[PDB]
Amino acid sequence: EQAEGVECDFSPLLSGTPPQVYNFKRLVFTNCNYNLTKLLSLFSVNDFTCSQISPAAIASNCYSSLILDYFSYPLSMKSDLSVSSAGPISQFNYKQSFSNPTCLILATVPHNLTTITKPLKYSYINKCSRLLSDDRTEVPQLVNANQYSPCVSIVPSTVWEDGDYYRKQLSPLEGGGWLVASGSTVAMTEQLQMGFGITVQYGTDTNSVCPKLEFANDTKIASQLGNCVEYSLYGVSGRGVF
């Protein structure tokens, strides 16, 4: 037993300028008949891996919620998207969960997809840190799995030149002092390069985020009563007698 509904709307993704890594956009899908192929089919994918979930399950099981995080990304920088990465990008701009099942897709954009616009260049944060009220002590400020860079409100939509520094003082609420950061740029490639993060959540609600299968009259609860059957109810599997 599964609900009928509509397919996941990825139009927002495909209809504007790609976000920067430290200022990505998040699409949350609930109550949806998803189709992973349809979306990935639109890109000449370069790579796609997962963790704590099979390549099968990622596009065949039901989830309580599906999160898609998309942004512009230099293909050549893929080495720092690892959970055990060096950190220059991972620890400041964007990090992924190691507790929930996740995936990472890196793809280029084909000339046919003219609805998505091309950024001037790539930008990222080199470092982000806080200065204490003594204006002598400095402490690094890192980004967590579902957070934005701690100084995203300081760094502008683009870094004009390498070494550009940005600073603002902190209010008493934060303990005072200053929050400071600096970034760098990477030349744009011939074609737009983009990355997509996927996080899969289970068990926090009805698993109504599913594939799209057809049905029959012999897979109903009614008329199966009293018999031992296998079942799958909104992602909840098991065996028993109704």
Partner: antibody
Framework: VQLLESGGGLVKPGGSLRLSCEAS????????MSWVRQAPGKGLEWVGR??????????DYGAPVKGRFTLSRDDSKNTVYLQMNSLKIDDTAVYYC??????????????????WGQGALVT | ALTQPASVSGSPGQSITISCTGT?????????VSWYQQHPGKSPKLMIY???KRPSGVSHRFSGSKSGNTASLTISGLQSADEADYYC???????????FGGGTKVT
């Protein structure tokens, strides 16, 4: 502000040439320096630029002279150099020694060339 | 790349414009286009920068304007003394290069 440029002349393709210029009226160590060129009958074309010493005096080059031309500067003389390692016939053009600045701020920058020298011919 | 008219002209006292077009990544998003004026046999001089404003050495006849992905140089009450080659120049910060149009013959 005045920019004095010299070192032009004729060098057969396959050879090499070095241009130089001198700045006066400005604080050399506090400006960016850049070169452009213009061949007869054509529009303007960017050659390359160099940053301040305090910035590591790094450089950026136009594609047309990538791997062939090199920029450098010397703050003890207030001069700039452009050396053309390997010349081609297509490099026939008037070169111009100029400065480069930014307006606005770090949040939103805008770049432009304010001062220009007389220029020199390389052929 | 920047696209400009081959030539623009009119009688002294008239208003003319020189266009400079590109896409959203060139003109639309950022106000960073500059204009230069080059007299025959001479070096170029800066007329307008940041799509809006001029150096104090430039008369009020010259003003900047932008619409969509089109930048332009407006010459209000043009004089015969304004005859020159006008260039549209686009440049951001690092990881890029300076882009010039082919230049417009203004007479």
């Amino acid at each position: 502000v005045q920019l004095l440029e010299s070192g032009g002349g004729l060098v057969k393709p396959g050879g090499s040439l070095r241009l130089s210029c001198e700045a006066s009226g400005l604080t050399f160590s506090n400006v960016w320096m850049s070169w452009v060129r213009q061949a007869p009958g054509k529009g303007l074309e960017w050659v390359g630029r160099i940053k301040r010493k305090s910035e590591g005096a790094t450089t950026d080059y136009g594609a047309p002279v990538k791997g062939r031309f090199t920029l450098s500067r010397d703050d003890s003389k207030n001069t700039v150099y452009l050396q053309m390692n390997s010349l081609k016939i297509d490099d026939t053009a008037v070169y111009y020694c100029s400065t480069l600045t930014r307006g606005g701020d770090v949040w939103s920058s805008s770049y432009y060339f304010d001062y220009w020298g007389q220029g020199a011919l390389v052929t | 790349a920047l696209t400009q008219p081959a030539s623009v002209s009119g009688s002294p006292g008239q208003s003319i414009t020189i266009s400079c077009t590109g896409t959203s990544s060139d003109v639309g998003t950022y106000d960073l286009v500059s204009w230069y004026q080059q007299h025959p046999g001479k070096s170029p001089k800066l007329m307008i920068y940041a799509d809006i404003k001029r150096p104090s050495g430039v008369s009020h006849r010259f003003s900047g304007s932008k619409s969509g992905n089109t930048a332009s140089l407006t010459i209000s009450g043009l004089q015969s003394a304004d005859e020159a080659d006008y260039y549209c120049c686009l440049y951001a910060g690092s990881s890029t290069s300076v882009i010039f149009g082919g230049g417009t013959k203004v007479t």
